[PDB]
Design an enzyme around this catalytic site. Structure first.
Site, mmCIF file in Angstrom:
data_model
loop_
_atom_site.group_PDB
_atom_site.id
_atom_site.type_symbol
_atom_site.label_atom_id
_atom_site.label_comp_id
_atom_site.label_asym_id
_atom_site.label_seq_id
_atom_site.Cartn_x
_atom_site.Cartn_y
_atom_site.Cartn_z
ATOM 1 N N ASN A 188 3.840 29.021 30.825
ATOM 2 C CA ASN A 188 3.857 27.683 31.399
ATOM 3 C C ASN A 188 5.229 27.336 31.980
ATOM 4 O OD1 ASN A 188 3.748 24.977 32.097
ATOM 5 N ND2 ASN A 188 3.224 24.230 30.043
ATOM 6 N N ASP B 42 3.132 26.734 36.596
ATOM 7 C CA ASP B 42 2.303 26.933 35.415
ATOM 8 C C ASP B 42 0.983 27.606 35.787
ATOM 9 O OD1 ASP B 42 1.071 26.795 32.928
ATOM 10 O OD2 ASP B 42 0.642 24.650 33.081
ATOM 11 N N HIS C 252 -5.327 24.996 42.306
ATOM 12 C CA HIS C 252 -4.653 26.286 42.412
ATOM 13 C C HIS C 252 -5.534 27.292 43.133
ATOM 14 C CE1 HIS C 252 -0.810 26.568 40.363
ATOM 15 N NE2 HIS C 252 -1.247 25.714 39.452
ATOM 16 N N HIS D 23 0.905 24.638 43.470
ATOM 17 C CA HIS D 23 2.090 23.909 43.944
ATOM 18 C C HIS D 23 2.781 24.793 44.984
ATOM 19 C CE1 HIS D 23 1.705 21.195 40.510
ATOM 20 N NE2 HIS D 23 1.681 22.247 39.710
ATOM 21 N N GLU E 162 9.237 25.442 42.418
ATOM 22 C CA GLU E 162 9.221 24.922 41.053
ATOM 23 C C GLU E 162 10.233 25.652 40.177
ATOM 24 O OE1 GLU E 162 5.493 23.964 39.013
ATOM 25 O OE2 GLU E 162 6.485 24.168 37.072
ATOM 26 N N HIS F 238 10.804 24.591 36.840
ATOM 27 C CA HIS F 238 10.515 23.911 35.565
ATOM 28 C C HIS F 238 11.371 24.430 34.398
ATOM 29 C CE1 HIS F 238 6.983 21.708 33.356
ATOM 30 N NE2 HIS F 238 8.165 21.371 32.869
ATOM 31 N N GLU G 152 7.995 19.809 39.652
ATOM 32 C CA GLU G 152 8.737 20.027 38.407
ATOM 33 C C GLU G 152 10.045 20.797 38.575
ATOM 34 O OE1 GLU G 152 5.351 21.468 35.997
ATOM 35 O OE2 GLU G 152 5.366 19.551 34.960
ATOM 36 N N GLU H 36 -0.682 14.039 39.345
ATOM 37 C CA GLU H 36 -1.521 14.652 38.314
ATOM 38 C C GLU H 36 -1.913 13.606 37.267
ATOM 39 O OE1 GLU H 36 0.619 18.026 36.720
ATOM 40 O OE2 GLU H 36 1.366 18.601 38.698
ATOM 41 N N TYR H 37 -3.203 13.539 36.929
ATOM 42 C CA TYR H 37 -3.663 12.678 35.821
ATOM 43 C C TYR H 37 -4.963 13.216 35.220
ATOM 44 C CZ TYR H 37 -7.534 10.390 38.346
ATOM 45 O OH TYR H 37 -8.712 10.141 39.023
ATOM 46 N N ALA H 38 -5.377 12.654 34.085
ATOM 47 C CA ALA H 38 -6.627 13.055 33.412
ATOM 48 C C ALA H 38 -6.724 14.567 33.243
ATOM 49 C CB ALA H 38 -7.843 12.514 34.153
ATOM 50 N N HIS H 39 -5.817 15.095 32.423
ATOM 51 C CA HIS H 39 -5.681 16.528 32.171
ATOM 52 C C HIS H 39 -6.953 17.087 31.530
ATOM 53 C CE1 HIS H 39 -3.706 20.207 30.426
ATOM 54 N NE2 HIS H 39 -3.085 20.151 31.590
ATOM 55 N N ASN I 121 3.591 34.107 25.870
ATOM 56 C CA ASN I 121 2.542 33.514 26.683
ATOM 57 C C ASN I 121 2.202 32.127 26.155
ATOM 58 O OD1 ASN I 121 -0.289 33.804 24.998
ATOM 59 N ND2 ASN I 121 1.216 35.385 24.470
ATOM 60 N N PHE J 225 -3.523 27.344 27.717
ATOM 61 C CA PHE J 225 -2.999 26.270 28.551
ATOM 62 C C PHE J 225 -3.194 26.514 30.059
ATOM 63 C CE2 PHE J 225 -1.294 22.152 28.426
ATOM 64 C CZ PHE J 225 -0.370 21.991 29.461
ATOM 65 N N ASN K 134 -7.365 24.330 32.463
ATOM 66 C CA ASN K 134 -7.366 22.864 32.482
ATOM 67 C C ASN K 134 -8.344 22.266 33.486
ATOM 68 O OD1 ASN K 134 -3.862 23.375 32.815
ATOM 69 N ND2 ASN K 134 -4.960 23.303 30.850
ATOM 70 N N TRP L 211 -0.878 17.352 25.251
ATOM 71 C CA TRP L 211 0.290 17.806 24.490
ATOM 72 C C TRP L 211 0.928 16.684 23.679
ATOM 73 C CZ3 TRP L 211 -0.418 18.376 29.761
ATOM 74 C CH2 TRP L 211 0.274 17.473 30.597
HETATM 75 MG MG LIG Z 1 5.609 23.412 35.358
HETATM 76 NA NA NA Z 2 -1.733 24.432 32.715
#
Ligand SMILES: [Mg+2]
Ligand code: NA
Ligand SMILES: [Mg+2]
Ligand SMILES: [Mg+2]
Ligand SMILES: [Mg+2]
Ligand code: NA
Ligand code: NA
Ligand code: NA
Ligand code: NA
Ligand code: NA
Lengths: 1015, 1015
Positions: free
Chosen positions: A94, A193, A349, A383, A408, A410, A453, A529-532, A589, A593, A596, A991
């Site tokens: 991630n 991610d 993605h 992304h 990214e 992150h 990110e 991004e919302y409602a994962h 790893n 995750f 999603n 999370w």
């Molecule tokens: Mg990220």
């Molecule tokens: Na993910």
């Protein structure tokens, strides 16, 4: 020089000899071919069978490979990711970088893919013009050789790298050698991610242009106040020798009709003290009453750009689809064609469970159709820039696109370490600028994004301004560094909640309603991004949509995300199964995750998709008396392919139904008067269900497609009539070990040691395999587990709180078990305490009343200690001996629904096969619940009350003990979990605790009642 | 790899293995040494004797040179430009690139400088820590070798390049090899209007830093509303391994008194979701009543940054001068410490006539002293970051600095071709970012500039925003693309005129007064360049200053420019002379256009400097009756080193004088009552002169320095007295060819064929070598010639209009010549027409009246054809036979002054040697005029009237025929030009007509009168 320079560990070298970026070219030599978008002879695909050899490092590559096919190499299909062919392992991580954080260096062991192709070039391409090679996607960096001679180098995995081969090609057979590196300095800006793969994963092609050539063109459209007039402005740039006879003609087409045309010689307006661009020209075309492009109606024109001569001889032609639309933020609102958008978006993605990160038309078309069929109108390219075909399909089917730079970082500490460093500005700039240069002519792209990110650094501000200067037609957004920085035109947070503030230092996620009105804040808010949607999720989705509809400046968001990133693996028998992080020996790893999505990797919908479809409806309904008010949320189209079906049912029994054509203007209302309903004398609840149906097929849907629905309770007649008094009286039989009740061929056995109903008989047939016991726990959902990284252990996560409190290991202690004989019944009274280390967590007090008509009425009253974490559920479970084919219920359905995810479900009579009552989440958990159920039927059994239930061949114990769905085995008989009450699933994120207070089981005392009988 | 890669033809490679840019470091290991700014043992100069060899191309450099010296190479001083040692020619071109415009390519014949040095490195330097090499300036690109091994590469000629030599050095003897390329891809961004040179022209040094080191630091000062309270904020970055015991102490000193101190461990505040900067710390120090920095009072503090352990072992200290000041733009005004600046600025190139572009402390200090002594308060670094010491000297002496990035692409077509190209953003970004990183702590820098003459491209917008993001403390300006683009905080035009619009397409230069009020314009206006001081120039300078004082938002400008870019050459006799473009075989070239300075290359002032000094005065004056009103234009200081001297004179003869100490608050006024002045008996004009004198020496000036002056006419008593009637009568003698007049020992001769006084005798000695004749022409000034490029011929230029009209070759035709004997006089009457190809240009009608007292009264009436271009002058000239030592005049002086440049001159009796009456402009032109003259004395001759004159050993003809001042030869006798009227010199620019209408000789009819006699 190649092995000595190490260009892949130097962010100051992102390419060598690479050509300038540009919009899609085909170099047509016929105008009619350009207009119709038919294949060009000058654009050749090199996709197909290539030669490939894997190496652990670039130093391991033998020099003989530059001129000769290696006999060890295999023949493989290109485009491909080489992890999907099994040469090395794909890695799922991630945040943490897949390599040691030491910029600009990568590991000395650097997996290297040596691709090569022997191919023919026709004589015609050698005598005249320019032949270039185009690699649409190479992950992550590569050197290029043609016929043993070094050509160039390229970085950025998500944009085309192009090189002139004119001076390298020969008559007949030629060989390309491509050395692809998995890791490079580019990898530091590619920390998305997702699975970390590599290789030549997008198209490879040859393009032949004349020496005198269209090298760039930009299409702009501007409008008057009411969009009744437009000017199409086209800037065209040329390369080659300038001549006085040269001309550019830009013509605009609507089907076979030319609507506008302009012709001019080269020579732009004076720009400064030194003049203008002699090698450029800008054509302006007037269009009266243009047909406007939107996601509702994707009206398109064809622009054909002709480089020709004064006396009328064509040199070449390029072309693009043109959508006439205007995008602007005004007075805090994002407007398209002057109207405020409501973004029903999703992050997508580029993923395939078999082919990895290689994209194909069929899969792309599949995603678009499913998106539109589920009321989505927008997609964020999370992304990175996408496969070029994606924008074409978005243009043509109609979706709003956020096009996002491949940046990214992150995993950096802090997140802006690179993006605030001026030394990383060059690498970053190319990822932004070359994206814009490629995609700026696509009408579907309405917003630019600076990446994802990567904190907020000064490089973001520089590049924000660059885009604003180069393309005023689109807002620029960026979430990094607090979602409301100076680098964004749109407040674009990720996982900001509706009502609840999350006041993290420096980068708070404010309530979206509060964020809008902060002192000085004027911008629109659209969540990037919302409602994962991780596993059993989308709890509280309706809360977002209520707020979006209420607040003008809340203009929607992009769900995270479209499709599970599961990969296919095969077991001993060669049977396919869905794999996630760690399943490839990849370490460290981040496990499940990577999954999603609203859909499984094979594009089979998760239950959450129907909730998304329902909340994202374009028609809203109100009921007053027998008047249904339909309101349209379309901005542009009338409801010209819509009819309203209505039906009234009494506890699932149809009574009346009809249909009415819908004729609603955009933003308009229609009132529909329901005919007088024939009321029933018999008891029960009348339910009205309305559905909007599309009678005719579209480009994206079949005839009869249901686009919207809503339910209301109408009249209820409460049952007052007594049940018919039975003649027989049940008989109580007492022993030291058991209480037994008998009535006809039916027996109930209550164990006096345990205090539970341990067995039931219909004749000599046993009905139970495990006793009927209270349950207060669930097999933990991904949301309960509350983990974004496999290393992170959070004592605040629901599952950790339940574990720490002893919820999963609390044993029932018997307090009371008594039997009494009534006039027409036997009454069993029980009481139990559940304890952990001398602490009483729960108390259950029950009565079982078994009457002469064979019904067992179970009354349950539960106490929950106020200081124990609120339980996941309050109900009963048991393992039934029966395995039946069908499950029939009167309640909410047909699909899986939970208390904070049940708005899409409808109350009716539902009947499914048993396997449909289980949701095959790749990471197994509590699943398949249906809420608001008044009656459940299974084999000989009927249960009545007001409960939530799930029913399957898998116990909660097995579900929580098994990491993958393919490892699950059907148990003997059927596990029934019947709940009085059940906790929300949450999902604002996955999370941290995301279940809203009102869906937590915090009342302390709980009551429910069930009637169990054999019908 | 080196010859194969060709990094000098790649805009994508601007360095290899170069270290990050930073503020000036010395790595002190003692805090006291850091505080006092004494030499550091850890910073060694490598300046001195190096080894140099010249090569026509890099491919011609022998591979032996890497490991071993070439005996064929010479010993030369470094820093130097190699053109100044004779190895090749310096090229002077203005706009046109010195190489073919083919980016990124340079000529294959690319002159190459091979520098090398053999030096000792002590053991202590290699045992512990890091040893870096710093090249402060290498023009224009270079590869670096240490002991035969390749270290790195660097571009940008005007910023330090630094490399770690830790792994390259050995104890004892080492060898450096530097291969410097004259041309590179960096040359495309280095097209400044200056001599094109090359080499290691700035310092070379070695810096020893400990492993655990201060790698960067930033000092900020913020203030409360009234500047009575300040917070100094210092961000400090470290490299090396982080440890809990590490600390930074920032202490602030005022002389030997410590005023504030802060100590903290490393670890910045949380920045984003990943944390903060573990390797950074920010110290905040409170300062009460800070002494504020300005150009008026350059108050400085010393900041010492100590990196140490918790218990107090110093690891290393860095330091800097701190000036507490706030620079902001508010409500359209640029404010320093809350007060609106008036910029008395000048552009200054780094130029030395003997050393080229190598700067030394002595020349820098000389320049600063002369600037401040001539009322300048600001400097613009045209057009590149300067030698690091310049900023230190501006900090300490007090000058406002515009720090400008090394970017000029003037020669591109259009000017923004590279700056609007994203492919050039990386190279551009480094020229901006590395300047800010270097210079951000210097209080003297108040404004950043993005470069010069590069049009306006998207890259400017990006880098504008980058600076605004990184450094909020300073406005950003940039003139390119019209001077008011989105890339500039200040309207900063070059050569916009005061009242006159110049409406060029796309990039107009509006009248500065008009520009301010254009719809929607709100910014301040400060000209980056104005009043082009090329040769005999600065005409109309007063018009600018009048406008600056009247309009709040006109806040001044920077004169173009400080110092003539002339270079010393030597003649056959070894005598030095000043050379301009073309004098080195350099072609193409732009000739004398490299000389635009207020001072000669040896820092001797041009006459224009005094006009600038006078107009830039900080005290303003008004007279009303006996009252002098003195107004201060200081913003911060009281006039505590100033006294006003006043003197009244009658036609040069002193009558009364006094002095009064000035006590004026900043922006305040002081009234000074003059005592009652006694009436003079005799006729004439009373004049009042005031001067502001500085009784005390300063850091920038000597005791008795004059900072300001002003003059008024007081009472005039017109002469009504009749001159004593003489008893002598002049005698007329007539012949065919002459009228002769005799009186005592005096004789006059009028040639009847020419109509001019051909000879005059005193004691039978001839007074004339050439007859007295009308003159309507001048040896053209650079402003008359009107050329910015030697290839461009402009028919609109004054010289071209005069030439085309036949002004320079029109010959006198006699119309009338008569003589009449009167009572006490002889009267000669003449009339002449000057004609060119049929057209009568001018007519001159004269009387000469010679009376018994020996005086010859000449009356002249001239007609000028309305359709002929207005003539340069209307007067007479002759070659006198006498050479006298002194020139004595009653008029404006003492220095050269012209009608549109005479505000600085005062009316008085002046007496100078004859040589002072000639201004040695390097390109010879009309010069040495003095205006408003009532009496001129030379040998036995006196001329009276109201005229302008010049007097020298050089005729207008020789002046206009000679291209260099050293080629001028004194003619026999003395040329006198006496003008009734003379055209302005102009100078708003030097490449278009710039003489304002009120200074053109357009009246059509002109009258003047002269009395010639002997005293
Ligand atoms: Mg990220
Ligand atoms: Na993910
Ligand atoms: Mg690289
Ligand atoms: Mg280069
Ligand atoms: Mg220039
Ligand atoms: Na809204
Ligand atoms: Na599980
Ligand atoms: Na002003
Ligand atoms: Na010049
Ligand atoms: Na001359």
């Amino acid at each position: 020089v190649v092995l000595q320079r190490r260009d892949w560990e130097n962010p100051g070298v992102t390419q060598l000899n690479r050509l300038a970026a540009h919009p899609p070219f085909a170099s047509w030599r016929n105008s009619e071919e350009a207009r119709t978008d038919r294949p060009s002879q000058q654009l050749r695909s090199l996709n197909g069978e290539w030669r490939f050899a894997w190496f652990p490092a670039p130093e391991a590559v033998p020099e003989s490979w530059l001129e000769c096919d290696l006999p060890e190499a295999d023949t493989v299909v290109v485009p491909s990711n080489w992890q999907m062919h099994g040469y090395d392992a794909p890695i799922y991580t991630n945040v943490t970088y897949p390599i040691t954080v030491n910029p600009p260096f990568v590991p000395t062991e650097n997996p290297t893919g040596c691709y090569s192709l022997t191919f023919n070039v026709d004589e015609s391409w050698l005598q005249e013009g320019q032949t270039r090679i185009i690699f649409d996607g190479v992950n992550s960096a590569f050197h290029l050789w043609c016929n043993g001679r070094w050509v160039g180098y390229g970085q950025d995995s998500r944009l085309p790298s192009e090189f002139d081969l004119s001076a390298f090609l020969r008559a007949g057979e030629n060989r390309l050698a491509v050395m692809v590196l998995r890791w490079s300095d580019g990898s530091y800006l590619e920390d998305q991610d997702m699975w970390r793969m590599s290789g030549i994963f997008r198209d490879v092609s040859l393009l032949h242009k004349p020496t005198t050539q269209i090298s760039d063109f930009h299409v702009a459209t501007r409008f008057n106040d009411d969009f009744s007039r437009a000017v199409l402005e086209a800037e065209v740039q040329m390369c080659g020798e300038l001549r006085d006879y040269l001309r550019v003609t830009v013509s605009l087409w609507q089907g076979e009709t030319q609507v506008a045309s302009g012709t001019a010689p080269f020579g732009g307006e004076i720009i400064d003290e030194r003049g203008g661009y002699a090698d450029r020209v800008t054509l302006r075309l007037n269009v009266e009453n243009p047909k406007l492009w939107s996601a509702e109606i994707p009206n398109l024109y064809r622009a054909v750009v002709e480089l020709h001569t004064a006396d009328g001889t064509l040199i070449e032609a390029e072309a693009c689809d043109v959508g006439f639309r205007e995008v602007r933020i005004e007075n805090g609102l994002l407007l398209l064609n002057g109207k405020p958008l409501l973004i029903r978006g999703v992050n997508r993605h580029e993923h395939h469970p078999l082919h990895g990160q290689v994209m194909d038309e069929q899969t792309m078309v599949q995603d678009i159709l499913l998106m539109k069929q589920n009321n989505f109108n927008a997609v964020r390219c999370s992304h990175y820039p996408n496969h070029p075909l994606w924008y074409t399909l978005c243009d043509r089917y109609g979706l709003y696109v956020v096009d996002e730079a491949n940046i990214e970082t992150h995993g950096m500490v802090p997140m802006n370490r690179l993006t605030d460093d001026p030394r990383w500005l060059p690498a970053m700039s190319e990822r932004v600028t070359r994206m814009v240069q490629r995609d700026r002519n696509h009408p579907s792209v309405i917003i630019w994004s600076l990446g994802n990110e990567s904190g907020h650094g000064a490089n973001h501000d520089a590049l924000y301004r660059w885009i604003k200067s180069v393309d005023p037609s689109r807002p620029v957004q960026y979430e990094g560094g607090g979602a409301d920085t100076t680098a964004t035109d749109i407040i674009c947070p990720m996982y900001a909640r509706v009502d609840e503030d999350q006041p993290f230092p420096a980068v708070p996620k404010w309530s979206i309603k509060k964020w809008l009105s902060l002192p000085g804040e004027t911008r629109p808010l659209i969540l990037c991004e919302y409602a994962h949607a991780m596993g059993n999720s989308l709890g509280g989705f309706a809360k977002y949509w209520q707020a979006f509809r209420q607040y003008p400046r809340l203009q929607g968001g992009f769900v995270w995300d479209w499709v599970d990133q599961s990969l296919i693996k095969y077991d001993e028998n060669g049977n396919p199964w869905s794999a996630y992080g760690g399943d490839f020996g990849d370490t460290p790893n981040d496990r499940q995750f990577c999954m999603n999505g609203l859909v499984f990797a094979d594009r089979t919908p998760h239950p959450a998709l129907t909730e998304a479809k329902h909340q994202q409806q374009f028609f809203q309904f109100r009921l007053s008396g027998q008047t249904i008010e339909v309101t349209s949320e379309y901005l542009f189209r009338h409801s010209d392919n819509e009819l309203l079906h209505w039906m009234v049912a009494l506890d699932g029994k149809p009574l009346a139904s009809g249909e009415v054509p819908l004729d609603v203007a955009p933003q308009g209302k229609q009132l529909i008067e329901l005919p007088e309903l024939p009321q029933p004398e018999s008891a029960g609840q009348l339910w009205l269900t309305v559905r909007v149906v599309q009678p005719n097929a579209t480009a994206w849907s079949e005839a009869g497609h249901i686009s919207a629905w809503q339910q209301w309770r109408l009249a209820e007649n409460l049952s007052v009539t007594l049940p018919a008094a039975s003649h027989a009286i049940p008989h109580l039989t007492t022993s030291e070990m058991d209480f037994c009740i008998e009535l006809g061929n039916k027996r109930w056995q209550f164990n006096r040691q345990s205090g539970f109903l341990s067995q039931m008989w219909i004749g000599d047939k046993k009905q139970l395999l495990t006793p009927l016991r209270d349950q207060f726990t669930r097999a933990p959902l991904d949301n309960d587990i509350g983990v974004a990284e496999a290393t992170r252990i959070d004592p605040n996560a629901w599952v950790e709180r339940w574990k720490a409190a002893g919820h999963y290991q609390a044993e029932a202690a018997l307090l009371q078990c008594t039997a009494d004989t009534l006039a027409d019944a036997v009454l069993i009274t029980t009481a139990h305490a559940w304890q952990h280390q001398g602490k009483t967590l729960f108390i259950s007090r029950k009565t079982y009343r078994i009457d002469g008509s064979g019904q067992m009425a179970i009354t349950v009253d539960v106490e929950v200690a106020s200081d124990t974490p609120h339980p996941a559920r309050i109900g009963l479970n048991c393992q039934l001996a029966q395995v039946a084919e069908r499950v029939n219920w009167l309640g909410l359905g047909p699909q899986e629904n939970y208390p904070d995810r049940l708005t899409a479900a409808c109350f009716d009579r539902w009947d499914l096969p048993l396997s449909d009552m289980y949701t095959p989440y790749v990471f197994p958990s509590e699943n398949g619940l249906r809420c608001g159920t008044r009656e459940l039927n299974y084999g000989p059994h009927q249960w009545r009350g007001d409960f939530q239930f799930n029913i399957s061949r898998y116990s909660q114990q097995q579900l929580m003990e098994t990491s993958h769905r393919h490892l699950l085995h059907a148990e003997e008989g059927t596990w029934l979990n019947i709940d009085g009450f059940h906790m929300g699933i949450g999902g604002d994120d996955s999370w941290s605790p995301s279940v809203s207070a009102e869906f937590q089981l915090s009342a302390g005392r709980y009551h429910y009642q069930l009637v169990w009988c054999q019908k």
